Structure 1
Amino acid sequence: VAALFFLIPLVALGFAAANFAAVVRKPEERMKEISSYIRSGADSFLAHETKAIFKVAIVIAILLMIFTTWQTGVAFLLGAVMSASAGIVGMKMATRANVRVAEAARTTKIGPALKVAYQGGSVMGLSVGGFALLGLVLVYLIFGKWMGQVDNLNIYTNWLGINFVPFAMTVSGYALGCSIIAMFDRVGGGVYTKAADMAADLVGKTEPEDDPRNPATIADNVGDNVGDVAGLGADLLESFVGAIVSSIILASYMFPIYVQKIGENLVHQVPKETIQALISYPIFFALVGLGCSMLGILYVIVKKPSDNPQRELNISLWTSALLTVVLTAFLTYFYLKDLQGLDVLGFRFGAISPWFSAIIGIFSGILIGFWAEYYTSYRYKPTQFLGKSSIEGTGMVISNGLSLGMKSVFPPTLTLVLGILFADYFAGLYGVAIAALGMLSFVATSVSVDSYGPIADNAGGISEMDPEVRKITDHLDAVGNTTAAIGKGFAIGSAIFAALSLFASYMFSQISPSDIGKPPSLVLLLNMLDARVIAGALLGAAITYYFSGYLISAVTKAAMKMVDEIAKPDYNRCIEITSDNALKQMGYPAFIAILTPLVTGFLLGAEFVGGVLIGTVLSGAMLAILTANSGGAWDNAKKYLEAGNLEKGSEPHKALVIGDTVGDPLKDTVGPSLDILIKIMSVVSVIAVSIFKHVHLF
């Protein structure tokens, strides 16, 4: 049967490739040229990024093999290739799918055209899911079972003298690869995306607002795809992989931590069989999630498309989530029934214990999404207050947006607090990680619905460059914008969950062979009364704020570089100038996110790094929530004024447009980069704590 679960990744990959081929079959003369224009620009950006990322990955794998065991470097390469493949597939799928849906809208008059766009987005969603789970299964087989990485499950010592559970180190390397690709995609692509929006909206004003023949306008469509299709997909992939890797690390290290030396011999209080089963269970959970998501997507694409698009995708999400719930019910119920010693791990239900954590994480993600919706949409009270206040002043608009974000911080944080508390009550930290996984159990469906958004935005833009077709694409673009906001909120929540699980794995990875005799209370400890920890937390929070602030100036500078530049059309592909600049400009923030654990870890030690991690996680969650919600609220409040639904080209509209020019880079670059900051720093620290746990120079 496990051979029939291993088949789910290949099934998903083949089904996504088939969806790609079928949309290639979908029909697209003047309109087709622009789609070719955008596809070529996206391919140039992807090539530049891929070259840079693979050079960096070569260096990363070399360092990993030199300073740790080599299998971790090999797994890093595997995961990086998986993520790059998913991103490239989705973007290539979409660049040629943007116009196809428009041709579907005219030929099908609304209704059938949406089926094409969703079959497109499903390509990227299933690609993310299948590639991630494929990399993980290959790591568990080739390294886990083939090489006997689960057979040992004892502290292996590197040739230089580094101690670690080998399979935990390998899964950590895989998570690191995913994190590197996700960081490059989102940080660099977001810098480029908001530089393109800023350059387009400024060039319209430079010499008309969003001109169609503006090169930066084409770049902006490309950036929407780079951000919410490729970048967001990679971010969700990273969070999901991180949750799974945290679960696996926790199990592997609960193997050595729960031992008792009554005499010379050492008796494992948790048998190796239990540790193996706990290492394997999250993978089975993710595979079940992928299966349920594919079933839901199949029912959605096949059945008679209703007029209301949002209800269809919402029902797809509900199907995936609740089906995964009910099925992993049995998986959790039987798989963990035979394990021995689960009361020591903290399981309040034995076999089904973690399933509760998973489901509560699912509902947590759902609720946080709903919260983001409530605070960022014109259909609810807060955005309406901002839109109506637009008459009061421009400074009033900015202050009200900042206050709205600050207030919105609370509800989702309370949701996450309750989810964490109940997941802990159920199954300890392993269950907290399992709850994060459950939240991201249907990561494939989430990524697909998120990719849908940019395609709809591109369809509306295509209408802007038939009256019924233009209006229908505009409505599709608005629904896509709402879905993208919901996706950003869900991604932030899952990122907080993954970063917390990775901090837990970091504390668990800090186990040492000398601590074997010590009780569990001594090893799994990061005291907050130690001055080193407090200083580390302050430093991590300040670094998170510094990263978020730097992203704003980077977007502005890249946009200014695009402004400096610029057969009547001939060939204009300025994107590289911005993209290359973005790839250079994102260099410094990345150096922070990766190198902060090492220096402070080698300067002060592992306890200081834990404080840096917790402070960074907290500050990043808060700042990301604030920035994302502020940007989304400014955008849709401006949309409300555009329709004039209540309360165009006026003074209030000027205040709103300035607030949106500020919010775009904040919600589409800073926010989306902060979660990556927290999670990748957690991963890098989890890995390097093996080296600077005892190697601290002060």
Structure 2
Amino acid sequence: YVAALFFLIPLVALGFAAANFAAVVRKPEGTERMKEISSYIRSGADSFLAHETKAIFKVAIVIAILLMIFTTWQTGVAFLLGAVMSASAGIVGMKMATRANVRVAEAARTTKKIGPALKVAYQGGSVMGLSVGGFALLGLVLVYLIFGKWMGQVDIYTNWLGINFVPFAMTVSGYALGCSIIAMFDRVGGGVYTKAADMAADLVGKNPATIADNVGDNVGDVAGLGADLLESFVGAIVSSIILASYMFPIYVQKIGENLVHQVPKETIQALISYPIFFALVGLGCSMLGILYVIVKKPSDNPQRELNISLWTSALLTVVLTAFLTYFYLKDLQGLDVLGFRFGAISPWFSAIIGIFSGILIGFWAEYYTSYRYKPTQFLGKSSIEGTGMVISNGLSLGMKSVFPPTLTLVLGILFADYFAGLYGVAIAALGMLSFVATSVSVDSYGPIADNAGGISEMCDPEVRKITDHLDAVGNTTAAIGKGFAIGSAIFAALSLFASYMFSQISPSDIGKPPSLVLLLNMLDARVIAGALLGAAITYYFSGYLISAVTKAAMKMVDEYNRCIEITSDNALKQMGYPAFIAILTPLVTGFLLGAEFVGGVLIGTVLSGAMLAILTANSGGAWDNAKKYLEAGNLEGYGKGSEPHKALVIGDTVGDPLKDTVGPSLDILIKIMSVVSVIAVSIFKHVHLF
């Protein structure tokens, strides 16, 4: 029947990846030289891939035993599964990118034109997207099937240390943590590497060991960007389930010495299962979206192509979900009490809002960052007033650039909660992040294309024309993408804060009104302090990474797989450090000061991290595109040399660590710190010191 059919969807996603893999490999490369440059970058990634995975492993071990001891073994098992699922995606995506690039450039010559070359480049990228979708959903299907149904977890426990939680809630929290861990290293570690290289490269003006930087371009927006969305994706689904699950013990009435589950088992179990099926449809829609664009007759405009896949995947998801939402939950009862203002159909509306939020947030990120529209143009043209001015105007731009996307978030959240309550916020995150496969594909297109262009550069002009066109679009979709990935990061984290608070329900809270158990009071000094602490930590976090990039860059600068191994090792050492902050802060503050304080910290972290991620992303991209702006020739009389170009160079170099390392790291911070807190609040709620 219809059940398992849906549950094999991640498999189909995976097979499609597995197919796209096949169809890419059979494409050729021209000449010994196209191959020779290619081998440099492909080997570079694995070397880099080796040390980190190995580093990850050591960390992954320590965390797993701990979850099993302090929570339950399922939770510990689930965690490794999530880590493996995300891990796997990265291993696959990196391998693909560094081989697909060449066959684009050659496409730009073998097939001899740009439309059949876009079809190549895009096919590679989709492997990363479908694997991200396929793995993430496959894992959750496994955990659901094995631990949820068979072991009866879907059928409120307190464990051998007296730590209490709803088993499955706790279980998926581990799974979420796993994805988080692989994302953090990929971002806070790989992010340091990529920009250390870019800096280093931009610090030796004469064939330099740029190859490091070239793998970086892949490392960052394929693996890093990809892992971010997966986590937010998983973050959105997990958060929907956690809030749902705890609603069961929360909503009980005491009726004459009986306990009456005012939200009954049937209702809870569906609201739990619902986001998974939603996500399957999302994954399904992207497959239809992906294939259509793939099979289509080629175009001259690859931007239009890429865009067809998103919209197709998104229209599709909006539609089936309404049926999905309507028929499912159709006769459920108590949805009123659950927070469903318009009954059965309510959460579909939330998903739509998230979807539309996502698209808008993308436009805003682009708007403030792309010359073609006003903000970046002015920055660019302000270069004529000096280096001071370029820097000042770029800071001013980004600080302002924060308001429209955040306002977009504000209105979306406001409307989200009207439709489906706190649950609606989490479902919004999921809708936002539905079609994630296609979303990640368009992100991944950028590096696949960029090296291809580079690969043309290292070895015609007619060929370079196609090459240059592909890249222009890559860089845009990458900028839209970050902006979208940040939007989703904020929404996930907000869901995860909600998750943190639901997860605090105690046996000893049972009875009392929702308004008395779902509460973090800001008038409480601990919560205010918490918020300030988390905010300071987020700025510190951001600060450390800037200095980290230059440290590592410099480590490279003093002098091709060895130079990569050297800085990669140094890169890892300096990943640990942020990670203590990221991982232990809930633990440290929790065991010191308790659940209220940590609630503060999470809020500070999210608020400050949301603002700073956006600021750095847009101003950093602006500075780059401002550099681009003058280089295409637009200030008239100024071009590729001259004091304004220098000032723009200086601005881009300030910008380069900020947009591609700091901001994207902050995405992970505001999430993982929440996920961790969701898990550890099991313990430090009761056992805290003061």
TM-score range, shorter chain: over 0.9
2-side partners of 1:32 and 1:693: how far apart?
Answer: 58
Superimposed CA distance per residue, residues 73-117 of structure 1 (whole angstroms, 9 cap, x where no aligned partner): 100010110001111111101111110111101122211011000
Q: Alpha-carbon deviation of 1:494?
A: 0.2
Q: How far apart are the structure 1 equivalents of 2:561 and 2:358? A: 42
Following TM superposition, by how much is the alpha carbon of 1:334 offset from its aligned partner in structure 2, in angstroms?
Answer: 0.8
Tell me if the contact between 1:460 and 1:474 (Cα under 8 Å) persists in the aligned partners.
yes
Asked if 2 retains the 8 angstrom alpha-carbon contact of 1:424 and 1:431, the reply is yes
User: After superposition, what is the alpha-carbon deviation per residue over 1:228-269, rounded to whole angstroms, capped at 9, x for unaligned?
Assistant: 000110000000100100000000000110001122221100
Give the CA deviation at 1:216: 3.4
Residues 639-648 or 323-332, more deviating? 639-648
Q: Summarize deviations over 1:484-536 as a string: whole Å, max 9, x none.
A: 00000000000000000000010000000010021111100000000000000
Question: In structure 2, what is the Cα distance between the partners aligned to 1:23 and 1:204?
Answer: 36
- Is this contact kept in 1: 2:250–2:510, CA < 8 A? yes
2:649 & 2:627 partners in 1: Cα distance? 7
RMSD: 0.9
Q: 2:299 aligned with 1:299, yes or no?
A: no
SS of 1:524's equivalent in the other structure is coil
Work out the CA distance in 1 between the residues paired with 2:150 and 2:280. 20
Partner of 1:210: none
How far residue 574 of structure 1 moved from its aligned partner, in angstroms, is: 1.1
Are the counterparts in 2 of residues 506 and 682 from structure 1 also a CA contact under 8 Å? Answer: yes
Return the offset for 1:436.
Answer: 0.6
Partner of 1:31, secondary structure, is: helix
Counterpart-to-counterpart distance in 2, 1:216 and 1:323:
46
Residue 14 of structure 1: how far off its partner (Å): 1.0
Residues 199 and 562 in structure 1, CA contact (< 8 A), matched pair in contact too: yes
Contact 2:620/2:658 (CA < 8 Å) preserved in 1? yes
* Contact 2:453–2:471 (8 Å) recurs in 1: yes
> What is the CA–CA distance in structure 1 between the aligned matches of 2:333 and 2:140, rounded to whole Å?
26
Q: Deviations over 1:41-88 (max 9, x none)?
A: 101111111111111111110111111101011000101100011111
Structure 2 residue matching 1:46: 3-state secondary structure:
helix
CA distance in 2, matches of 1:249, 1:628: 31
Q: Is the 8 A contact 1:336 1:350 kept in 2?
A: no
Secondary structure of 1:215's counterpart equals coil
1:340, CA displacement in angstroms?
1.4
Q: Does the aligned pair in 2 maintain the 1:197–1:216 contact within 8 Å? A: no
Contact 2:47 2:561 in 1 (8 A): no
User: Any conservation in 1 of the 2:530–2:604 contact (CA below 8 Å)?
Assistant: yes
Distance (whole Å) between structure 2 residues aligned to residue 144 and residue 370 of structure 1: 40
| 1:572 Cα deviation from its structure 2 partner | 4.5
- The change in CA–CA distance for 1:255 and 1:319 in structure 2 (over 3 A counts) is same
Q: Deviations over 1:369-407 (max 9, x none)?
A: 000111100110010001111001100000000000000
- Counterpart contact for 2:43–2:561, Cα < 8 Å: no
Conserved? CA contact 1:45–1:579, under 8 Å:
yes
User: 1:187 touches 1:669 (CA, 8 Å); kept in 2?
Assistant: yes
- The equivalences for 1:269-418 within 5 A come to 269-418=262-411
Superposed displacement of residue 471, structure 1: 2.4
Measured in 2, the distance between the counterparts of 1:364 and 1:137 equals 27
| Partner Cα distance (2:436, 2:241) in 1 | 18
Q: 8 Å contact 1:41–1:222 — kept in the other structure?
A: yes
Deviation at 1:550, TM superposition (A): 0.4
In the alignment, the residues of structure 2 paired with residue 632 and residue 502 of structure 1 have an alpha-carbon distance, to the nearest angstrom, of 28
Gaps of 5+ in 2: none
What CA distance in whole angstroms lies between the structure 1 residues aligned with 2:681 and 2:333?
30
CA shift, 1:460, in A, is 1.5
Matches within 5 A, 1:610-689: 610-647=599-636, 648-689=640-681
Which deviations, in whole Å up to 9, do the C-alpha atoms of 1:576-629 show, x marking residues without a partner?
111111111111001101011011101010000001001110000000000010
Shift in Å, 1:459: 1.3
Shift of 1:305: 1.3
Q: CA deviation at 1:645?
A: 3.0
Whole-Å separation in 1 of the counterparts to 2:231 and 2:562: 31
Partner in structure 2 of residue 536 of structure 1: 530
Q: Is the 8 A contact 2:44 2:561 kept in 1?
A: no
- Return the alpha-carbon distance in structure 2 between the equivalents of residues 126 and 446 of structure 1: 10
How many angstroms apart in 1 are the aligned matches of 2:655 and 2:136?
32
Deviation, 1:470, is 1.8
Please report how far the alpha carbon of residue 474 of structure 1 lies from its aligned counterpart in structure 2 after TM superposition. 1.7
Match of 1:215 among 203, 208, 215: 208
- Contact kept, 8 Å, 1:215 with 1:572, in 2: the verdict is no
Count how many residue pairs are aligned between Structure 1 and Structure 2: 682
Counterparts of 2:582 and 2:209, CA distance in 1: 30
Looking at structure 2, the residues matched to 403 and 353 of structure 1 have their Cα atoms a distance apart, in angstroms, of 40
- Counterpart-to-counterpart distance in 1, 2:666 and 2:393: 23
Where do residues 512-531 of structure 1 align in structure 2 (5 Å cutoff)?
512-531=506-525
Tell me the distance in 2 between the aligned counterparts of 1:493 and 1:268.
36
* C-alpha distance in 2 between matches for 1:320 and 1:16: 17
Cα deviation for residue 215 of structure 1 reads 4.8
* CA distance in structure 1 between the partners assigned to 2:390 and 2:578 by the alignment: 30
For residues 175 and 209 of structure 2, the distance between their equivalents in structure 1, rounded to whole angstroms, comes to 36
* Aligned residues of 1:75 and 1:171 also touching (Cα < 8 A): yes
- 2:42 aligns with 39
SS in 2 for 1:693: helix
Q: Distance in 1 between matches of 2:75 and 2:651?
A: 46
Q: CA contact under 8 A between 1:121 and 1:452: conserved in structure 2? A: yes
The separation in 2 between residues aligned to 1:14 and 1:81, in whole angstroms, is 18
Secondary structure of 1:337 counterpart: coil
Aligned-residue offset at 1:338? 2.1
Once the two structures are TM-superposed, the CA of residue 282 in structure 1 deviates from its matched residue by: 0.4
Q: Is the 8 A contact 1:624 1:674 kept in 2?
A: yes
Q: Are 1:693 and 2:679 matched, yes or no?
A: no
TM-score scaled to structure 2, two decimals? 0.98
Bigger mean CA deviation after superposition, 17-26 or 486-495: 17-26
The 2-side partners of 1:149 and 1:218 are apart by: 50
Deviation at 1:204, TM superposition (A): 2.1
Moved over 6 A (4+): none
Whether the aligned pair in 2 keeps the contact of 1:104 and 1:113 (CA below 8 Å) is yes
- Secondary structure of the structure 2 residue equivalent to 1:649: coil
Q: Secondary structure at the match of 1:216?
A: coil
Tell me the alpha carbon deviations over residues 335-357 of structure 1, each in whole angstroms, 9 at most, x when there is no partner.
11121110011101211100000
Scaled by the length of structure 1, the TM-score of the pair is 0.97
Distance 1:244 1:56 in 2: 25
Give the whole-Å Cα distance in 1 for the aligned partners of 2:623 and 2:450: 18
In 2, Cα distance between equivalents of 1:180 and 1:468: 45
- Structure 1 residue 646, shift from structure 2 partner: 3.5
Tell me, in whole angstroms, the C-alpha distance in 1 between the residues paired with 2:354 and 2:364. 15
Contact 2:492 2:671 in 1 (8 A): yes
Query: In 1, distance between residues paired with 2:494 and 2:625?
Result: 32
Query: Residue by residue, what CA displacement relative to the aligned partner does 1:411-437 show, whole Å, maximum 9, x if unpaired?
Result: 000000011000100000001100110
How big is the shift at 1:455? 1.0
Identity in percent: 100
Give the distance between the partners of 2:644 and 2:478, measured in 1 at CA. 26
1:41–1:573 contact (8 Å) kept in structure 2: no
- SS in structure 2 of the partner of residue 525 of structure 1: coil
DSSP-derived class of the 1:366 partner: helix
Deviates more, 1:101-110 or 1:498-507: 101-110
- Is the Cα contact below 8 Å between 1:99 and 1:462 reproduced in 2? yes
Listed one character per residue, the Cα deviations across residues 606-664 of structure 1 (whole Å, up to 9, x for unaligned) are 00000100111000000000001011001111111111134311110000001100101
**C-alpha distance after superposition, 1:548-593 (max 9, x if no partner):** 000000011000000122xxxxx64311111111111111001101
Q: Do the aligned partners of 1:631 and 1:663 also contact (CA within 8 Å) in 2?
A: yes
Comparing 20-29 and 393-402, the one that deviates more: 20-29
Alignment partner of 1:21 is 2:22: yes
2:143 maps to 1:139:
yes
Distance 2:362 2:230 in 1: 18
Distance in 2 (CA, whole Å) between partners of 1:150 and 1:324 is 26
Distance 1:469 1:348 in 2: 58
Question: Cα–Cα, structure 1 residues 671 and 427, in superposed 2: closer, same or farther, change >3 Å?
Answer: same
- Alpha-carbon distance in 2 for matches of 1:636, 1:573: 33
- Deviation for aligned residue 1:691: 0.2
Q: 1:598 aligns with which of 579, 587, 610?
A: 587
Give 1:694 shift: 1.1
> C-alpha separation between the residues in 1 aligned to 2:658 and 2:600?
26
Select between 188-197 and 26-35 the one with higher mean Cα deviation. 26-35
CA contact (8 A) 1:215 1:574 kept: no
